[PDB]
Amino acid sequence: TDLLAGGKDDVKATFGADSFVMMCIIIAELIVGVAMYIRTKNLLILLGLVVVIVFTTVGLTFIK
């Protein structure tokens, strides 16, 4: 061989578990979800946050 193997580390660290990008994604889910809930009063929509957390955790496991 993979002629670009050397690039895997930084990329994986910049889009990975404790990255700035994942923090921004969780913040966005929190804000957008609470705004949707305030507008519609559909309590189930708050589970969105849970979903995103799980999806980003488990999902990052498949990134090799």
What is the biggest distance separating any 2 CA atoms in the chain, rounded to whole angstroms?
Answer: 55
CB-based contact 56:22 (threshold 8 Å): yes
- Which parts of 41-60 interact with a second copy (CB under 8 A)? 41, 43-60
The residue (of 13 and 24) whose beta carbon lies closer to ligand LHG is 24
Residue 40 interacting entry, from ligand LHG, a second copy, none, C-beta within 5 to 8 Å by type: ligand LHG
Helix axes 20-40, 47-61, angle to 10 degrees: 160
Cβ at position 40, least distance to a second copy in Å = 10
Q: How far apart are CA 53 and CA 47, in angstroms?
A: 10
Residues binding a second copy (CB under 8 A): 2-8, 10-16, 18-21, 23-39, 41, 43-64
